[PDB]
From a paper:
Here, we show that the Legionella macrodomain effector MavL regulates this pathway by reversing the arginine ADP-ribosylation, likely to minimize potential detrimental effects caused by the modified ubiquitin. As full-length recombinant MavL behaved poorly in expression and purification, we chose to proceed with MavL42-435, a construct that was recently crystallized and its structure reported. Our apo-MavL crystals belong to space group P1 21 1, with eight MavL molecules in the asymmetric unit. We then tried to capture MavL in its ADPR-bound form through co-crystallization of MavL with ADPR and soaking MavL-UbVME crystals with ADPR. Interestingly, the same R370-involving protomer:protomer interaction was observed in MavL crystals obtained from co-crystallization trials that failed to yield bound ADPR. Thus, it appears that the arginine insertion contributes to packing interactions outcompeting ADPR binding.
Author numbering: 37 to 409
Amino acid sequence: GPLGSAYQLLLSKETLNKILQYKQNLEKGLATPGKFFLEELSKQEKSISEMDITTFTQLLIQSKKPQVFAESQVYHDGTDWTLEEESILGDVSVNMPVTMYNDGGHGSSFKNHPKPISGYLAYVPGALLASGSGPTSDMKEVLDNGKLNQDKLNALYERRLLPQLIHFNELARQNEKQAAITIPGIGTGCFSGAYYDVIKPYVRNALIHILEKHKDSLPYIDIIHYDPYMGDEPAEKKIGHMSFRVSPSGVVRGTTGQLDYPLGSNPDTHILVSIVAWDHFSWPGNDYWGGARQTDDGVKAASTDTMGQVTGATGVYDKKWGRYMPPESFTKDRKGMSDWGDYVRENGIVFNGPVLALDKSGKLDTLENVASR
């Protein structure tokens, strides 16, 4: 993004193929962009054929808005995003280094870190199984006549999580460390919709299946700390060389927070990575762009310098409310209405950064290189 914005977008090979088909369809005049993607294309000068696959992908990602309720405010047609665009945006993840100012507890339960922790976030959109209008792209993929299909849900989460796991397996090796990864109940909140009573065992089965399938590609990943809060039994499972842990903090007293080192890891031996349950249509942090420290997405963004990594501005952590605030100068001269979404609008900030793809060999590369092979 702007000057001091450091984040990296990632997507799978299968997602890249969807982007290539969509770009080709547009080049032939056989498809029509949704309202918001149409707006981003209108504001730049390149025709579809002139732009490379990376620029095209970045512009589709740029159509995301800071705050969107994907489960209730989207129509899945031309008036906002089409199903073809939605299928691509759900597969896009974004990682960034962050300072973590508290352990990420919801509400008033957060524990401030005496010294803020240096780690990483990986925002990944969960399976969207709720809609205020027609069915969603994820529904058409993982639901067979109404049944959640465990195998299809597995393939969905493998598509979206594996690029981030490959990134942080490689990042840990670069730092002569292992990786400790904390995972929330991704897609088990509002995204589950009518499937709230079956989704949570399905999600951990998907996590286990991804780690079991790709254990030989993740030798520097050591600990996976999965915390669905409630609705699951505590357990530990050795998966190859990795320790997979189901530690529901609402059932087990003393569980380490999502933005904290799990048992058996420390800053000398491990890098700390937290997965964030993201949203097809929103910037990283979603709700907190409107000042609401709510949901896993908004809690983790408010409890990190996420908004500083997206905007390039230097915020100030409010240790009484557990939220990373905009610069004081902004929250005084525009004191009443000065959340991070207001800063974005006043400064013309857009969401747009480098993007890589996971090729068939398990390496992250430019979209141009992965498409040519």
